[PDB]
Amino acid sequence: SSVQTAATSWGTVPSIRVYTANNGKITERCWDGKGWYTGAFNEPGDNVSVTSWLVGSAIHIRVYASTGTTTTEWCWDGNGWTKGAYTATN
Numbered sequence: 001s002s003v004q005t006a007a008t009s010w011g012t013v014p015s016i017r018v019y020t021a022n023n024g025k026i027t028e029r030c031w032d033g034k035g036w037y038t039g040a041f042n043e044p045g046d047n048v049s050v051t052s053w054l055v056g057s058a059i060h061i062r063v064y065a066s067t068g069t070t071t072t073e074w075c076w077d078g079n080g081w082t083k084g085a086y087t088a089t090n
């Protein structure tokens with residue numbers, strides 16, 4: 001078995017974020033033009049997907065973390081990771 005990843009990027013530098021699900025936990029690695037460093041994201045999950053969009057130069061990141069049949073959305077909007085309103089019936 002193997003770790004599972006999800007990736008997003010934005011701009012032309014670019015910024016890149018790679019999320020890795022390992023051991024029921026998702027962590028984050030970051031590229032902003034000058035080497036890979038560890039990001040603030042740390043949430044439970046066996047499976048991860050991600051999307052992001054810009055408003056002007058402000059990134060908005062949504063990470064979908066799944067454990068069992070429960071998927072939780074995590075939101076980055078410039079000032080801390082918050083829990084999003086996403087729900088599903090799995």
Ligand SMILES: Cc1c(C)c2c3c4c1OP(=O)(O)Oc1c(C)c(C)c5c(c1C4)Cc1c(c(c(C)c(C)c1OP(=O)(O)O5)OP(=O)(O)O2)C3
Binds near residue numbers: 002003004
């Ligand atoms: C935590 C975890 C994940 C995230 C998994 C799988 C397993 C898993 O539980 P684990 O405790 O590792 O138990 C297993 C052990 C010990 C072995 C030896 C296994 C498998 C599993 C089951 C089956 C398995 C799985 C795979 C993939 C890609 C392979 C090749 C694969 O066969 P292989 O590695 O020979 O055989 O999918 P993936 O890794 O994404 O999903 C399924």
Ligand SMILES: Cc1c(C)c2c3c4c1OP(=O)(O)Oc1c(C)c(C)c5c(c1C4)Cc1c(c(c(C)c(C)c1OP(=O)(O)O5)OP(=O)(O)O2)C3
């Ligand atoms: C507790 C447990 C259950 C109930 C599972 C699975 C696993 C499992 O974890 P574990 O056995 O510790 O880790 C694995 C290990 C050590 C190996 C070598 C595995 C698998 C697993 C994953 C993958 C796997 C699973 C299967 C089936 C039918 C096969 C053939 C099957 O490939 P197999 O050649 O055995 O590879 O479904 P099953 O209903 O058994 O579901 C999936």
Ligand SMILES: OC[C@@]1(O)OC[C@@H](O)[C@@H](O)[C@@H]1O
Binds near residue numbers: 038040041061076
């Ligand atoms: O500059 C790094 C950082 O703030 O970028 C936005 C998000 O990816 C955060 O988790 C991360 O720590």
Ligand SMILES: OC[C@@]1(O)OC[C@@H](O)[C@@H](O)[C@@H]1O
Binds near residue numbers: 085
């Ligand atoms: O600002 C957070 C939020 O409203 O952003 C858009 C969607 O991701 C929603 O689920 C989420 O709660």
Ligand SMILES: [Zn+2]
Binds near residue numbers: 002
């Ligand atoms: Zn393996």
Ligand SMILES: [Zn+2]
Binds near residue numbers: 004
């Ligand atoms: Zn898988």
Ligand SMILES: [Zn+2]
Binds near residue numbers: 023024046
């Ligand atoms: Zn687990």
Ligand SMILES: [Zn+2]
Binds near residue numbers: 055058060077
């Ligand atoms: Zn905004």
